[PDB]
Write an enzyme that holds these catalytic residues in place. Structure first.
Site, PDB file in Angstrom:
ATOM      1  N   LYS A  48       0.792  -1.198   0.000  1.00 43.99           N
ATOM      2  CA  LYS A  48       0.000   0.000   0.000  1.00 43.99           C
ATOM      3  C   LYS A  48       0.853   1.291   0.000  1.00 43.99           C
ATOM      4  O   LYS A  48       0.323   2.359  -0.287  1.00 43.99           O
ATOM      5  CB  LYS A  48      -0.987  -0.049   1.203  1.00 43.99           C
ATOM      6  CG  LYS A  48      -1.966  -1.250   1.174  1.00 43.99           C
ATOM      7  CD  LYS A  48      -2.729  -1.358  -0.177  1.00 43.99           C
ATOM      8  N   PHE A  89      13.204  -4.722   3.824  1.00 46.43           N
ATOM      9  CA  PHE A  89      14.210  -5.394   4.604  1.00 46.43           C
ATOM     10  C   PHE A  89      13.585  -6.211   5.730  1.00 46.43           C
ATOM     11  O   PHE A  89      13.775  -7.428   5.831  1.00 46.43           O
ATOM     12  CB  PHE A  89      15.208  -4.332   5.123  1.00 46.43           C
ATOM     13  CG  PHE A  89      16.026  -4.710   6.302  1.00 46.43           C
ATOM     14  CD1 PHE A  89      16.762  -5.895   6.338  1.00 46.43           C
ATOM     15  CD2 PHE A  89      16.210  -3.810   7.328  1.00 46.43           C
ATOM     16  CE1 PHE A  89      17.567  -6.214   7.415  1.00 46.43           C
ATOM     17  CE2 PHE A  89      17.044  -4.107   8.449  1.00 46.43           C
ATOM     18  CZ  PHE A  89      17.741  -5.329   8.471  1.00 46.43           C
ATOM     19  N   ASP A  94      11.529 -11.159   8.323  1.00 46.86           N
ATOM     20  CA  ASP A  94      10.458 -11.597   9.228  1.00 46.86           C
ATOM     21  C   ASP A  94       9.724 -12.798   8.656  1.00 46.86           C
ATOM     22  O   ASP A  94       9.355 -13.706   9.373  1.00 46.86           O
ATOM     23  CB  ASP A  94       9.466 -10.451   9.407  1.00 46.86           C
ATOM     24  CG  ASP A  94       8.300 -10.833  10.289  1.00 46.86           C
ATOM     25  OD1 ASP A  94       7.198 -10.952   9.778  1.00 46.86           O
ATOM     26  OD2 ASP A  94       8.542 -10.994  11.505  1.00 46.86           O
ATOM     27  N   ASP A  98       9.212 -16.138  10.735  1.00 46.05           N
ATOM     28  CA  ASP A  98       7.860 -16.587  11.038  1.00 46.05           C
ATOM     29  C   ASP A  98       7.334 -17.747  10.250  1.00 46.05           C
ATOM     30  O   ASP A  98       6.180 -18.157  10.423  1.00 46.05           O
ATOM     31  CB  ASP A  98       6.908 -15.378  10.916  1.00 46.05           C
ATOM     32  CG  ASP A  98       7.207 -14.283  11.936  1.00 46.05           C
ATOM     33  OD1 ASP A  98       7.970 -14.589  12.920  1.00 46.05           O
ATOM     34  OD2 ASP A  98       6.683 -13.079  11.813  1.00 46.05           O
ATOM     35  N   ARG A 103       2.999 -13.099   0.998  1.00 50.41           N
ATOM     36  CA  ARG A 103       3.183 -11.708   1.388  1.00 50.41           C
ATOM     37  C   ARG A 103       2.805 -10.865   0.206  1.00 50.41           C
ATOM     38  O   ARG A 103       3.216 -11.183  -0.946  1.00 50.41           O
ATOM     39  CB  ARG A 103       4.639 -11.477   1.731  1.00 50.41           C
ATOM     40  CG  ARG A 103       5.109 -10.034   1.837  1.00 50.41           C
ATOM     41  CD  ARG A 103       4.596  -9.328   3.112  1.00 50.41           C
ATOM     42  NE  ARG A 103       5.189  -9.871   4.336  1.00 50.41           N
ATOM     43  CZ  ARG A 103       4.903  -9.470   5.562  1.00 50.41           C
ATOM     44  NH1 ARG A 103       4.025  -8.497   5.787  1.00 50.41           N
ATOM     45  NH2 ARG A 103       5.469 -10.057   6.582  1.00 50.41           N
ATOM     46  N   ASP A 165       9.616 -10.198  20.580  1.00 51.34           N
ATOM     47  CA  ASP A 165       8.655 -11.029  19.812  1.00 51.34           C
ATOM     48  C   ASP A 165       9.091 -12.495  19.784  1.00 51.34           C
ATOM     49  O   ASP A 165       8.306 -13.375  20.125  1.00 51.34           O
ATOM     50  CB  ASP A 165       8.449 -10.425  18.401  1.00 51.34           C
ATOM     51  CG  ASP A 165       7.595 -11.282  17.482  1.00 51.34           C
ATOM     52  OD1 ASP A 165       6.419 -10.905  17.266  1.00 51.34           O
ATOM     53  OD2 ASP A 165       8.100 -12.302  16.920  1.00 51.34           O
ATOM     54  N   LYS A 191       8.662  -3.219  18.247  1.00 50.41           N
ATOM     55  CA  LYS A 191       8.746  -3.927  16.967  1.00 50.41           C
ATOM     56  C   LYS A 191       8.049  -3.203  15.820  1.00 50.41           C
ATOM     57  O   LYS A 191       8.395  -3.401  14.617  1.00 50.41           O
ATOM     58  CB  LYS A 191       8.301  -5.415  17.096  1.00 50.41           C
ATOM     59  CG  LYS A 191       6.822  -5.692  16.948  1.00 50.41           C
ATOM     60  CD  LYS A 191       6.552  -7.126  16.526  1.00 50.41           C
ATOM     61  CE  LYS A 191       5.049  -7.493  16.670  1.00 50.41           C
ATOM     62  NZ  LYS A 191       4.683  -8.882  16.246  1.00 50.41           N
ATOM     63  N   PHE A 230      -2.216  -0.127  15.460  1.00 46.81           N
ATOM     64  CA  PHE A 230      -1.923  -0.735  14.173  1.00 46.81           C
ATOM     65  C   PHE A 230      -1.509  -2.185  14.329  1.00 46.81           C
ATOM     66  O   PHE A 230      -1.951  -3.053  13.553  1.00 46.81           O
ATOM     67  CB  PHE A 230      -0.880   0.059  13.458  1.00 46.81           C
ATOM     68  CG  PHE A 230      -0.490  -0.534  12.136  1.00 46.81           C
ATOM     69  CD1 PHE A 230       0.575  -1.375  12.039  1.00 46.81           C
ATOM     70  CD2 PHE A 230      -1.196  -0.201  10.999  1.00 46.81           C
ATOM     71  CE1 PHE A 230       0.926  -1.926  10.816  1.00 46.81           C
ATOM     72  CE2 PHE A 230      -0.861  -0.721   9.775  1.00 46.81           C
ATOM     73  CZ  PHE A 230       0.195  -1.584   9.689  1.00 46.81           C
ATOM     74  N   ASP A 234      -3.218  -5.567  13.128  1.00 50.41           N
ATOM     75  CA  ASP A 234      -2.449  -6.587  12.419  1.00 50.41           C
ATOM     76  C   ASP A 234      -2.649  -8.001  13.015  1.00 50.41           C
ATOM     77  O   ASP A 234      -2.801  -8.986  12.298  1.00 50.41           O
ATOM     78  CB  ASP A 234      -0.976  -6.252  12.420  1.00 50.41           C
ATOM     79  CG  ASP A 234      -0.169  -7.278  11.628  1.00 50.41           C
ATOM     80  OD1 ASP A 234      -0.398  -7.327  10.412  1.00 50.41           O
ATOM     81  OD2 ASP A 234       0.638  -8.013  12.212  1.00 50.41           O
ATOM     82  N   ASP A 235      -2.675  -8.086  14.332  1.00 53.13           N
ATOM     83  CA  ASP A 235      -2.853  -9.346  15.002  1.00 53.13           C
ATOM     84  C   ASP A 235      -4.275  -9.922  14.757  1.00 53.13           C
ATOM     85  O   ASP A 235      -4.471 -11.128  14.629  1.00 53.13           O
ATOM     86  CB  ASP A 235      -2.628  -9.155  16.498  1.00 53.13           C
ATOM     87  CG  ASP A 235      -1.149  -8.921  16.894  1.00 53.13           C
ATOM     88  OD1 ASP A 235      -0.254  -8.926  16.046  1.00 53.13           O
ATOM     89  OD2 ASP A 235      -0.913  -8.670  18.101  1.00 53.13           O
TER      90      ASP A 235
HETATM   91  O1  LIG Z   1       3.563  -8.391   8.482  1.00 51.04           O
HETATM   92  P1  LIG Z   1       3.576  -9.286   9.722  1.00 51.04           P
HETATM   93  O2  LIG Z   1       2.193  -9.631  10.147  1.00 51.04           O
HETATM   94  O3  LIG Z   1       4.331 -10.547   9.400  1.00 51.04           O
HETATM   95  C1  LIG Z   1       4.398  -8.392  11.154  1.00 51.04           C
HETATM   96  N1  LIG Z   1       5.765  -8.130  10.716  1.00 51.04           N
HETATM   97  C2  LIG Z   1       6.610  -7.333  11.398  1.00 51.04           C
HETATM   98  C3  LIG Z   1       6.163  -6.255  12.199  1.00 51.04           C
HETATM   99  N2  LIG Z   1       7.118  -5.493  12.851  1.00 51.04           N
HETATM  100  C4  LIG Z   1       8.474  -5.747  12.721  1.00 51.04           C
HETATM  101  C5  LIG Z   1       8.944  -6.772  11.939  1.00 51.04           C
HETATM  102  C6  LIG Z   1      10.343  -7.092  11.769  1.00 51.04           C
HETATM  103  C7  LIG Z   1      11.406  -6.232  11.805  1.00 51.04           C
HETATM  104  C8  LIG Z   1      12.767  -6.631  11.650  1.00 51.04           C
HETATM  105  C9  LIG Z   1      13.077  -7.940  11.434  1.00 51.04           C
HETATM  106  O4  LIG Z   1      14.344  -8.492  11.272  1.00 51.04           O
HETATM  107  C10 LIG Z   1      15.379  -7.557  11.297  1.00 51.04           C
HETATM  108  C11 LIG Z   1      16.651  -8.083  10.929  1.00 51.04           C
HETATM  109  C12 LIG Z   1      15.686  -7.738   9.986  1.00 51.04           C
HETATM  110  C13 LIG Z   1      12.022  -8.834  11.485  1.00 51.04           C
HETATM  111  C14 LIG Z   1      10.707  -8.398  11.627  1.00 51.04           C
HETATM  112  C15 LIG Z   1       7.970  -7.541  11.285  1.00 51.04           C
HETATM  113  P2  LIG Z   1       4.489  -9.523  12.530  1.00 51.04           P
HETATM  114  O5  LIG Z   1       5.443 -10.737  12.272  1.00 51.04           O
HETATM  115  O6  LIG Z   1       5.167  -8.759  13.708  1.00 51.04           O
HETATM  116  O7  LIG Z   1       3.041 -10.022  12.911  1.00 51.04           O
HETATM  117 MG   LIG Z   2       5.483 -11.876  10.471  1.00 46.42          MG
HETATM  118 MG   LIG Z   3       7.146 -11.481  13.042  1.00 47.97          MG
HETATM  119 MG   LIG Z   4       1.342  -9.982  11.912  1.00 44.09          MG
END
Ligand SMILES: O=P(O)(O)C(Nc1cncc(-c2ccc(OC3CC3)cc2)c1)P(=O)(O)O
Ligand SMILES: [Mg+2]
Ligand SMILES: [Mg+2]
Ligand SMILES: [Mg+2]
Ligand SMILES: O=P(O)(O)C(Nc1cncc(-c2ccc(OC3CC3)cc2)c1)P(=O)(O)O
Ligand SMILES: [Mg+2]
Ligand SMILES: [Mg+2]
Ligand SMILES: [Mg+2]
Lengths: 344, 344
Positions: A48, A89, A94, A98, A103, A165, A191, A230, A234-235
């Protein structure tokens, strides 16, 4: 919608971004530059662009039209794309961490055949491109160092958050007592909230010569609360969103995550329900995931989320009344309108 | 040996490093800070510290003793540790990408139980600690921005190199025609030479107020050639080194890498030997790896390496005569003595 207004010009600046990062002086690295172009095209495009667009929109609202000349605008669109590169990045890394599948409407980059864990390098290259762009477009501006430091600090905070996390969600290790509201707030602040909400507005602030400690602290009081909301949204969307709108399949239950859903569940559950949660959380089995979702539905968590979204909106708008001045409230309202009632 | 002289004080500065990065204002992140301390203790400690030590040694040789006061030395030891943090970031990620087993005499961090791919985050946190330390110790120094940019640029170059490494070595895809001397030189220049050799000396140069384009270009002419030799030695030691000295098991043959060994093989092989190489390279089977090693032994590559090491030493020393001035030749000789005849 001011995001619609700005969007076309922002998206078309991407060719420019790609062209300045992918070219003449060293043909020995051409294969690597070709690979970077593929990474950029697959991962930085198809969202977006809300975080990057927030930079541009905020810049236009904070800078006098007389100072919004051609070069000033290229810089603002570039810094917006830097935010999007940061996001790219983070998402690439992530998704690996995960064990995600999709995506932005396609298979995750690391799942693509012939990519796999080489994605770790591709992700970090995206991060490097931020600093290259800041140097190529902003090095002679009085805000250069401020932006370098902001991006670096936002990455650090985000990585601390990600550590919380991953620690609060050890694989195959269910301990529900860890999942508290207090812990939850801490995770999401670090995060998600710094980089997704404070970062883009602060970058625009710095570009407009607004560097005061007090002005930054006030903006942060709004923006970190927006960011918490936010990540709660997301959750909720991880489980209850439509993947053809969200563009990604949820993994929070299988990955044992400290989601807002599981915290709310824990607050409401009977001892019997607690046991069901415990036996079924954090496991790959599709029927165990389904049982957890059924429990969340039994406990009316969708209705709870809808009510929380109303109350949070109200609270954020109260913070804007409190903390916006001396910036135009529109800077914060545009971003709130984008996130509230989002189902995307 | 000037590295021995400086080593004890450098290593003991590590407690300081760990103490300033792991503390008071935010107890909500304590679990994350605890995890960072574990990552630092496992990954940044147990090497030889040669890259970081090069910073300190060079600083002492480039700065007048009158300017080597207590605080100036803390800064130089800190910047040395920043180089070691960079290395630790890179090794953690690289071990994942290369499917390595051991590093510095222990199991790779990602192989440890309960770590796995969370190591991607741990690695990037190490990278973030560099910028935190530079801010905490060097922000008021006239070289602050120069060092920030040097670290960022060195990371970019290194990541471009790593992209060439991974591309020239696609898993399960043997094409020996890719493995040329020209390509090899390009890979190693980018992936290893900038950060391992130019970076630490340049950081010391900047700390000593030596910021001239010409002085940097001259140092680079020496240091990038040193770096090429270093990576050739690394490739030789991957197969022919003793792991109880190197601290790590080699993976280059299995991982289909464009090593100096395979380039030399290709230059020497008969058509028959070429076919053997082709049928056995880039595969996990222990007996196929063993066949490749037998081929390299049949073609006298250990003796070829020993001769190359002599010729390269000579060439580097010629470059020092050519390009050292106006810096003390000892700056480059100390580093050459460390790397030549290394079997570690
Ligand atoms: O888009 P997602 O739903 O997967 C969210 N993604 C998300 C949200 N906030 C921060 C990150 C993040 C940031 C840096 C990361 O790794 C750093 C070395 C790259 C990994 C994940 C990733 P989340 O896993 O928290 O539910
Ligand atoms: Mg994730
Ligand atoms: Mg994550
Ligand atoms: Mg998420
Ligand atoms: O110590 P090793 O023998 O494993 C060498 N390690 C090495 C040498 N030069 C650069 C790297 C490196 C740098 C950055 C990396 O990933 C960036 C995102 C982190 C990965 C590897 C790693 P190599 O794999 O090249 O034989
Ligand atoms: Mg390796
Ligand atoms: Mg490698
Ligand atoms: Mg190696």
């Amino acid at each position: 919608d001011v995001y619609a207004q700005e969007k076309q010009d922002f998206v078309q600046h991407f060719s420019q971004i790609v062209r300045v990062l992918t070219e003449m002086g060293h043909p020995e690295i051409g294969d690597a530059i070709a690979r970077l172009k593929e990474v950029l095209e697959y991962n930085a495009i198809g969202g977006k662009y809300n975080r990057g667009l927030t930079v541009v929109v905020a810049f236009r609202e904070l800078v006098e039209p007389r100072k919004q000349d051609a070069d000033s605008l290229q810089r603002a669109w570039t810094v917006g794309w830097c935010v999007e590169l940061l996001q790219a990045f983070f998402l690439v890394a992530d998704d690996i961490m995960d064990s995600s599948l999709t995506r932005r409407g396609q298979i995750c980059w690391y799942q693509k055949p012939g990519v796999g864990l080489d994605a770790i390098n591709d992700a970090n290259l995206l991060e490097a491109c931020i600093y290259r762009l800041l140097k190529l477009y902003c090095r002679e501006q009085p805000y250069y160092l401020n932006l370098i430091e902001l991006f670096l600090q936002s990455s650090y905070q985000t990585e601390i958050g990600q550590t919380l996390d991953l620690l609060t969600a050890p694989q195959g290790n269910v301990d529900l007592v860890r999942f508290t509201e207090k812990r939850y707030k801490s995770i999401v602040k670090y995060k998600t909230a710094f980089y997704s909400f404070y970062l883009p507005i602060a970058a625009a602030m710095y570009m407009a010569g607004i560097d005061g400690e007090k002005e930054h602290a006030n903006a942060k009081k709004i923006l970190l609360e927006m960011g918490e909301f936010f990540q709660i949204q997301d959750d909720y969307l991880d489980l209850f969103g439509d993947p053809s709108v969200t563009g990604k399949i949820g993994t929070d239950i299988q990955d044992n995550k400290c989601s807002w859903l599981v915290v709310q569940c824990l607050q409401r559950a009977t001892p019997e329900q607690y046991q069901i949660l415990k036996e079924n959380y954090g496991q790959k089995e599709a029927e165990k995931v389904a049982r957890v979702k059924a429990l969340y539905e039994e406990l009316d968590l969708p209705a709870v989320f809808l009510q929380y979204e109303e109350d949070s909106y109200s609270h954020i708008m109260a913070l804007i009344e409190q903390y916006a001045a001396p910036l135009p409230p529109a800077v914060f309202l545009g971003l709130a309108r984008k996130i509230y009632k989002r189902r995307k």
